[PDB]
Symmetry: T
Subunit: 155 residues, 12 copies
Amino acid sequence: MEINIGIGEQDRAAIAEGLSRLLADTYTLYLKTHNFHWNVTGPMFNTLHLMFEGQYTELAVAVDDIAERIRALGFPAPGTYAAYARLSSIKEEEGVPEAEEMIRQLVQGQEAVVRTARSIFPLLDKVSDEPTADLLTQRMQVHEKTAWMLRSLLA
Amino acid sequence: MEINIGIGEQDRAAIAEGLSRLLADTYTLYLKTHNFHWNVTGPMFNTLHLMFEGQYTELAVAVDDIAERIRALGFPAPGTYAAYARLSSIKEEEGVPEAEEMIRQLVQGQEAVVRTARSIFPLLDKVSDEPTADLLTQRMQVHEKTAWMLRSLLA
Amino acid sequence: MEINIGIGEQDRAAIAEGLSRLLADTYTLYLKTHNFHWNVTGPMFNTLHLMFEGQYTELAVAVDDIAERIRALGFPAPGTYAAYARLSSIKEEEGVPEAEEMIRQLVQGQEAVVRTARSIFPLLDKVSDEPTADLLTQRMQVHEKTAWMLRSLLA
Amino acid sequence: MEINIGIGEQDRAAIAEGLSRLLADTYTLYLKTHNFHWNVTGPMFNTLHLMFEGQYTELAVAVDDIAERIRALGFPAPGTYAAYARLSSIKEEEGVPEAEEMIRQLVQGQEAVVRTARSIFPLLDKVSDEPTADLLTQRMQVHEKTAWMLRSLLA
Amino acid sequence: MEINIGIGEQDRAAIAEGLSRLLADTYTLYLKTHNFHWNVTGPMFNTLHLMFEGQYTELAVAVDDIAERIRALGFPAPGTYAAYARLSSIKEEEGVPEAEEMIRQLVQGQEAVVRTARSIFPLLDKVSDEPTADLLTQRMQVHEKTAWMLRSLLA
Amino acid sequence: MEINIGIGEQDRAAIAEGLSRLLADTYTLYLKTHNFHWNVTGPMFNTLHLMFEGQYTELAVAVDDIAERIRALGFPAPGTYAAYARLSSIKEEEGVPEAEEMIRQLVQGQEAVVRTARSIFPLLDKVSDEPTADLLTQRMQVHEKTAWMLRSLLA
Amino acid sequence: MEINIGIGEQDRAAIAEGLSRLLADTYTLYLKTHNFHWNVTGPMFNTLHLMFEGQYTELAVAVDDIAERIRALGFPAPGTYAAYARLSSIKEEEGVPEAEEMIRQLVQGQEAVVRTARSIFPLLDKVSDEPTADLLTQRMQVHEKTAWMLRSLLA
Amino acid sequence: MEINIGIGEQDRAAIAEGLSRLLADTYTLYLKTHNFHWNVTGPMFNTLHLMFEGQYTELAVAVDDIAERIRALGFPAPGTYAAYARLSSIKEEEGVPEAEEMIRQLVQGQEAVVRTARSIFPLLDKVSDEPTADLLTQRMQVHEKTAWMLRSLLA
Amino acid sequence: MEINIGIGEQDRAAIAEGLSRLLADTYTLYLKTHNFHWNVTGPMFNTLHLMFEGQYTELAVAVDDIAERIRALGFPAPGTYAAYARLSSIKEEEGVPEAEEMIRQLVQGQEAVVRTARSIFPLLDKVSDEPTADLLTQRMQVHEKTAWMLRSLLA
Amino acid sequence: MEINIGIGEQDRAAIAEGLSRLLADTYTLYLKTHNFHWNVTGPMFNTLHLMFEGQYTELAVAVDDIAERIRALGFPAPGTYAAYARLSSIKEEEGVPEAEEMIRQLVQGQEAVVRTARSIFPLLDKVSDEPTADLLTQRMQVHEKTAWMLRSLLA
Amino acid sequence: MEINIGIGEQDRAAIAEGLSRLLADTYTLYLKTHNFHWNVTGPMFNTLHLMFEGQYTELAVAVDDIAERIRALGFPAPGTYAAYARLSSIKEEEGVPEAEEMIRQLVQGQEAVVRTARSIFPLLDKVSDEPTADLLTQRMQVHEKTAWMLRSLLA
Amino acid sequence: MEINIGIGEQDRAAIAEGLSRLLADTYTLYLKTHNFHWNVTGPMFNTLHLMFEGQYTELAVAVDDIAERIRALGFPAPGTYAAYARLSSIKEEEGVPEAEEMIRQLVQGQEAVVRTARSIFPLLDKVSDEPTADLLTQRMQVHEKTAWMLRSLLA
Ligand SMILES: [Fe+2]
Ligand SMILES: [Fe+2]
Ligand SMILES: [Fe+2]
Ligand SMILES: [Fe+2]
Ligand SMILES: [Fe+2]
Ligand SMILES: [Fe+2]
Ligand SMILES: [Fe+2]
Ligand SMILES: [Fe+2]
Ligand SMILES: [Fe+2]
Ligand SMILES: [Fe+2]
Ligand SMILES: [Fe+2]
Ligand SMILES: [Fe+2]
Ligand SMILES: [Fe+2]
Ligand SMILES: [Fe+2]
Ligand SMILES: [Fe+2]
Ligand SMILES: [Fe+2]
Ligand SMILES: [Fe+2]
Ligand SMILES: [Fe+2]
Ligand SMILES: [Fe+2]
Ligand SMILES: [Fe+2]
Ligand SMILES: [Fe+2]
Ligand SMILES: [Fe+2]
Ligand SMILES: [Fe+2]
Ligand SMILES: [Fe+2]
């Protein structure tokens, strides 16, 4: 069926491409958060184990909402290691850093998702894609709150 | 009691008339979805009976939130067959189509409501009615997602 | 597949037409109750806003139960403005009455549905359709209880 | 201790005999629906697996309500394969039919239960046993609704 | 407001008087069951304490339903020691019987309420008050089942 | 089996005597609250119908706690119309007052229970029955708060 | 579609034959337990009515898991009176024994299912079917625990 | 750690200052609503006791959410009597008005919060702080809905 | 309506003034705890953020219980910054202390409420106001427990 | 840091010692009840298995509340076998009594805890430890109620 | 701190390596199932969308459990795209297959995980690691069951 | 009654002897964990207070499951201080260690329970006691997981 929702095929494709970057970033942050949740040690084990669990749990829902916005726009959602490693702007950590370095990396990762989302807005303004604009806003709200919570631990 | 929320009486009346068409479209889609939920038949009965129940259940909430934004703006909310037929841009199915046709009509229904919501955004462009704009957006998200789920069934 | 439930084709169709009128009254009353819920004002707003909410929420379930008794009997359930306006015996209200008058009409509404339900029991005398007799009975109980609670507000 | 509920010993014994048949049909249908729930295959596996799950789950309460009405009437409730195969009128299926045939046998199964319920009302005409009457009524209504939903799959 | 539910004042008043007797019996049984719940002793304390608790909890809702059927019929619901002693046919117990006599007495209690219910049906023959007939049918269901459970303890 | 909880038999029997008055007062107020919940009418019906439901629901628990404290002191708990009419200091209402009068009587009912409770404290202090003293305190808290809400309606 | 789970077809068939016996035994104990739940009488009625309900409720889940392990091994699951009376090794009770004998029959029924499970392990060890061995282990845990609870009543 | 969320320290501090006024208004209205909840009298006591409870409950969540957006922007959140007194624009009531005056003062308090929020948007449009704008918007939607409900009581 | 709960006007008024100080102390501790919840930083952020949230959530309910006991005594509940600044014995904090200092201050705050409540017992014993005495006792228990938990963090 | 809850080191120490006896008694009774829960046999198995489970579950919460009152008083809470064997007045049982002897021992254990509790009120009379006195009273309430339920089984 | 759980360091390392492959396999199947959940289309959309959600939701729990068993054995859990790509034996799917081919791929995926799990048992038997063996068995039970449900759709 | 479950009397007795050591160990660890939950102080108070509560809560269920396996094997379950201090292999701590030492002892406690379980498996393998073997496997899984979480805090 034709898709008649007030955005042309070429603009939908372009929003889908930006959202694909956002998805890869969110999913990469999801796995890293899940990773640090397993692997963190030291006197903050209990608090960071729990904190990270709440974060990756929220991220899993976000991954699903971002992907399904892509589907609503008429495009398949990417979902492989290869696609996400290419599309993602988050630094992957292959070892096991100390707790404070895990915290910093996760702070940076929240800001990376925010940065990716800020890059998509001018496009959304130009085509007046209000639903996608609201989704980006919610993600920034969540990632900027999570950033305050994480960095507060470092003071 | 004087209403002082930063939108003038004339402005609020135009917005209320906009939302009144959204409401009527939403309510008309509600009943059509409820109809098809009762009357669909075929090997897709169980999944369509259920999917349509989820849709009209969500729409019952939406009509109430729309009706009550009208009231917050200071105007009665319409609620009769006569006033919805007048305001509704959706054509009702008086018979019982095949299941594929039901699905096709419900996709068109979602798109009809998205259309009505887009027509109201300029009204707000002047007056700084952020709450109504968010409501229009939330409705576009829901209907654009439901469009995807419905049409995916055709493929 | 043939229907073999101890009721013949001609009878099932007659009972279906009966319930189609009960459906139409229940739904029209549902919409009016939901209407008054939005638009009532005065010192009884909170109590009436809440009472009418409870009422239309119950009626939404009743319409579904009535529609699906129709399908059980082997006939389509009606569900459009035009079909309900034809079949309905409910006094439509297009304006916004004072609170006391909303209560009064809502009382008459309950008694209208009771009346429609009573109009159907003779079709079940010779036929012995106990399920429909129980459905009719339950609606009478609910609508007569609601009539008491509403008219008590006037006294 | 004497049983004094307004029904004579020979009347109760006779209603119990009839409910013993209803129990045996319901239980036989329960087992068969559980059978199909496990063994059905084909593209409708997910919908029928769940649909048959919902039905046998409801029938598990039914068999218990029927048995305990027999105990209320002051007689033992039957509960062995031997007693249920004697009393049952459901055609038992020893193989694994295709999905469409599983559905038809369950449509018949519902109609078989309704038929048994109807054969019991005359016993109650003479004696005024309103509880048992309402039990047959509610069983008739569940099975007739279930039969609508099952046969809607075949069109 | 005129009450217009298909039962005239004179017939409504006769039913109300019948229900007032049923309300008084149910309530006197509620208090007796509550009494025994507190005062029973001996090896069956735990099982009877609990069983009786379940019975009086269900009776507390029944009195409310009966009383409110009387209001629906348009008459006041009795609620004083004086009025219940007058209307009630339950033999009050002023001492503390042994557990087995408590049980036998609560069996008689159940049968007594059934007896009162069985007496009201003729007033309904003439008038066709289907909601009230269903109320009595339910109460007979509950007390007859309860009577099976209670007397089973004595064998 | 002997009771050895730090209170001699005759002191326990005196405490139970007071608690029997408190019980009878609580149950009488329970029934009158239940009565007014059924029978109250006028503009306040919804709010009073509800408020009295919360009150009698609470009192039904209190009745049970008072009765079981009597049991714990080793005495039977009174539970008949005759014992409660004798023990109760609450004047019953055989008619149907206006709503403002219902409120008025229920306010005084709370104070009647507080008065019975206050009379028992000197005995509790004398024999140092801390649990009963705490129970009476809780009832006074509840009844005094309830009086404030009732009488707030009259201003 | 091919089944490739580390167990050859002939070995899976032999596992399915053992589980078909386990299934029939579990379902037979299910019906018997359900029977005794209905029909038991005497001073232990309340405790045995509830204890037997817990058991048959858990057995209903068990028959579903056993059946579906058969399905996962690639064979249809037996589900008729004929198949179960043939595959089952538990003597059914056609009558209504005393409470003490019902308990005894149920202890032995637990041991009967355990005995059938134990006969299957040498096969499971030979072919290394770890999931089925765990399923049998879980059944033995439940049946041996239930045996202890039942026989504890007789002492 | 640096804060890199797309907004420079200077604009963040000014957004923080505007939110501090929003927080002080929200919290002052919270306490006043709590106050009126405790102290309102008259026939509308139940309705407003409950209504004001719902309002201050919601407002307690809102003060948390505003305070934590301030923290996410990198500034401390004010939380003292002195600070909220300096920062709030809401008239404080040192006595106990009549109910109508309580309603009117709370209608104005909604509108004052809405007005403080409208004063903040210019700053956020110039800086594309989408999360804070959504926060301001939700606050407006709630207070404007609350103002409809409250003023509706007066008519 | 007169207040008759066994305590004269003058005594009730002196109790209300004591409870007014208790309320002011509790609300002031409530806001300071909320303040610290928002603004604490350092490696204990997560544990203190959560701990302080549990504390202020509990104090919100205590605020409401203290104020409503004032009302039950027949006096209006104070609730404004002016009243609480006048009545409160708690040292307020206008900056953002280090985590260890926040803890120590919250310990002090617990002890200040205890101190205020201890100051009120002499009056309660002379007049036998048992409910208010139980209230103070519950507050002292809660605050002395919270003090153990807070001060345990310092060790 | 320092403890300023108005009791004074020497008295807190005396009260802690008494609560240490209470804790030891409560915990010894917890284990004994748990022991009888596992080991009881005979016709009362189900009822006492469940009843003893209800009791030890409640005691688990009580040992925690008693221990933490000791901590609130500024002293460590004992918790080893050696300590509890020293502080405890409860008669340890090394075998498996008959059911009736199990009940009798548990009655005696409730009374042992009551007796220990009563020995502590004098340490409090001088000192004004309202929270500890309330804890003793709640424990006495629970154990005296449990004593009634237990000994009711013997009568 | 030393790990003393009855398994030497070298064997723990080797078990951790096998579980790492299981983890990578499980997580790759997680993402693919999640991918097909977003991207599947056609008449089975609703059923497969739901079915795949159930599966990936379960797999998300399994990835956590497998990783935390690796942590209990004393070794870091892998969690990056590069590490899973290296360890995983699952075939990635970079496009959007037809629904029948999605099904067949997920069937194969279940079998691949089962195959990885079977490869680990030999090591588990040399060293008696019961918990890890039980983990492998549970995973095999889940995936073999899922395999049946999936391939049942193809038939 | 004869216990017939495939294990002879001397073997069951030897299993019960091993499970009695396990139980004693589990119970002792339960009390020590509860002890440290009360008495731990320092900046980790909040996180260990909570962590230890989770552990001791789970150990109370384990205590119950191990004891009831002993009962199901036909032997009494030990439950006294004297028997547990004799059967148990865990060092009792009679003081209040520093937090890190509490963690250390709790790690060793988990490993002590594992060690006791390891000593029992050879017997279970010899006689093929599958249920007890699964119970020990679960206990090893829980304690090895807990050992990881505790020692992760030390690092
Ligand atoms: Fe975890
Ligand atoms: Fe999804
Ligand atoms: Fe439905
Ligand atoms: Fe609404
Ligand atoms: Fe609303
Ligand atoms: Fe429906
Ligand atoms: Fe299933
Ligand atoms: Fe049952
Ligand atoms: Fe009780
Ligand atoms: Fe009611
Ligand atoms: Fe009601
Ligand atoms: Fe009770
Ligand atoms: Fe039952
Ligand atoms: Fe199943
Ligand atoms: Fe309140
Ligand atoms: Fe917060
Ligand atoms: Fe937070
Ligand atoms: Fe309140
Ligand atoms: Fe148990
Ligand atoms: Fe605790
Ligand atoms: Fe979805
Ligand atoms: Fe985890
Ligand atoms: Fe605690
Ligand atoms: Fe247990």
